[PDB]
């Protein structure tokens, strides 16, 4: 019911299970629900910073992509043109915006009120943060509103459902495809966001360098060729010279040690 089968390729979970996984994942899960958090701190702004040889605070630094008018006696100095403006409006604040990719403008200001904090607080409540709102005929007696049969408006799992509904992928989903363990980039979210604490210089430098590698991977994709033919293990398995069995991982590792030692010796 939960998995497609022993091939282990697709999963389908219920709301309470997803809620439990989301709750257990709090130390490693992503908590930034507001997309505006990434303003001038996203893939495209890093691409622009690289193209413009401009480095915003906490952002990656790269080699420069490229090696009478506007004289100071003719310029009205009112506000310094910050580097953030050069990536925010790269065509307006730069004379030669070569290789620039125009960014996403903005997202509506987030108003998601948070919950799951006090065990008995309901799903619907007027949170302290909200401003107050300070401003004959007859029908058959059996006539009633739709869904009047259900007295409970809020069900026991409603708060969890609303929380999962706002969570970033993958806790946002109830079904999906399996992925390789190596494809789950657990720590990636930490460096894609600003440092959570005022860490030492070496830590901030590590954040910046991890971001640099990320930006380079995004800028230079290497698409796989559709020619799936001749994969090694499947090719070897087709011969009579290779056989298959099941063994403990430690046994397989020890065998590989002995085999490699024999090969090199």
């Amino acid at each position: 019911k939960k998995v497609n089968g022993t091939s282990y390729k697709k999963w389908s979970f219920d709301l309470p299970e997803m809620s439990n996984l989301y709750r257990l994942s709090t130390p490693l899960r992503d908590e930034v629900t507001d997309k505006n958090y990434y303003y001038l701190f996203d893939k495209k702004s890093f691409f622009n910073g690289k193209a413009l040889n401009n480095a915003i605070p906490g952002g990656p630094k790269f080699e420069p992509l490229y090696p009478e008018f506007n004289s100071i006696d003719r310029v009205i100095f009112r506000v310094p043109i910050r580097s953030e403006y050069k990536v925010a409006f790269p065509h307006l604040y730069n004379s030669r915006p070569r290789s620039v990719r125009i960014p996403w403008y903005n997202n509506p200001v987030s108003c998601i009120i948070q919950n799951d904090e006090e065990y008995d607080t309901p799903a619907l409540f007027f949170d302290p943060s909200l401003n107050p709102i300070p401003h004959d005929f007859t029908l058959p007696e059996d006539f009633a509103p739709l869904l009047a049969e259900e007295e409970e408006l809020i069900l026991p799992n409603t708060k969890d459902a609303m929380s999962l509904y706002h969570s970033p992928f993958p806790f946002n989903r109830t079904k999906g495809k399996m992925v390789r363990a190596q494809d789950v980039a657990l720590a990636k979210k930490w460096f894609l966001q600003h440092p959570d604490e005022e860490y030492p210089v070496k830590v901030k430098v590590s954040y910046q360098k991890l971001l640099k590698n990320y930006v380079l991977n995004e800028l230079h994709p290497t698409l796989p060729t559709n020619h799936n033919k001749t994969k090694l293990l499947k090719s070897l398995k087709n011969t009579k010279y290779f056989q298959q069995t099941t063994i403990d991982w430690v046994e397989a590792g020890l065998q590989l040690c002995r085999q490699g030692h024999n090969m090199l010796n």
Binding site: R23, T26, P27, Y119
Partner: peptide
């Protein structure tokens, strides 16, 4: 501020050493 998970102050939920629910070297 009191931690939502364990009540102890000084750390936020994500930094909590208690499972989510509902001396040091010189």
């Amino acid at each position: 501020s009191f931690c939502r998970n364990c009540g102890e102050a000084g750390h936020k939920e994500k930094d909590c050493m208690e499972k989510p629910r509902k001396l040091v070297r010189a």
